Amino acid sequence: TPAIDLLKKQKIPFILHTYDHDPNDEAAEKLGIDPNRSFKTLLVAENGDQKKLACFVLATANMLNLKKAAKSIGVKKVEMADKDAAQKSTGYLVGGISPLGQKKRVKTVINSTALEFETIYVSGGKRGLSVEIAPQDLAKVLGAEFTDIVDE
Numbered sequence: 393t394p395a396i397d398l399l400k401k402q403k404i405p406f407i408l409h410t411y412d413h414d415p416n417d418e419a420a421e422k423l424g425i426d427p428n429r430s431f432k433t434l435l436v437a438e439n440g441d442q443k444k445l446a447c448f449v450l451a452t453a454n455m456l457n458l459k460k461a462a463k464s465i466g467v468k469k470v471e472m473a474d475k476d477a478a479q480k481s482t483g484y485l486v487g488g489i490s491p492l493g494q495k496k497r498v499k500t501v502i503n504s505t506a507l508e509f510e511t512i513y514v515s516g517g518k519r520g521l522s523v524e525i526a527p528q529d530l531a532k533v534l535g536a537e538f539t540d541i542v543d544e
């Protein structure tokens with residue numbers, strides 16, 4: 393996947409994990425990972441403008457707090473990204489969105505809680521693949537910030 397191609401291109405350390413998706417947080421479950429360490433990637437539209445997207449990385453069970461997410465990227469509000477817009481920007485399908493290897497470069501924020509782990513798991517860009525990566529290495533590849541963007 394373009395996620396794996398980017399890491400290899402940039403020589404970023406990572407571990408590839410594979411599990412069997414059966415077509416019809418799967419990664420935490422099937423890899424026996426603590427859920428706090430398994431991160432999803434969600435896109436949002438800045439001020440509801442669906443070609444100005446931004447990317448948020450957060451534990452799979454956490455809910456994205458759109459007020460916090462807006463404030464983290466310096467915009468007035470954010471709304472959930474259109475299923476279609478997200479796909480054309482990322483090149484990935486929902487349930488397989490990697491923060492890595494996206495087609496379009498956008499701003500990226502990682503939830504702060506990521507920093508309490510040595511490594512975290514993010515989608516490898518296809519169901520059944522997970523990338524394990526140091527949070528600071530993920531941030532360096534994406535020019536990402538660490539900020540509080542969740543509820544609870």
Ligand SMILES: [Hg+2]
Pocket residue numbers: 447448490491492494498499500534
């Ligand atoms: Hg991203």
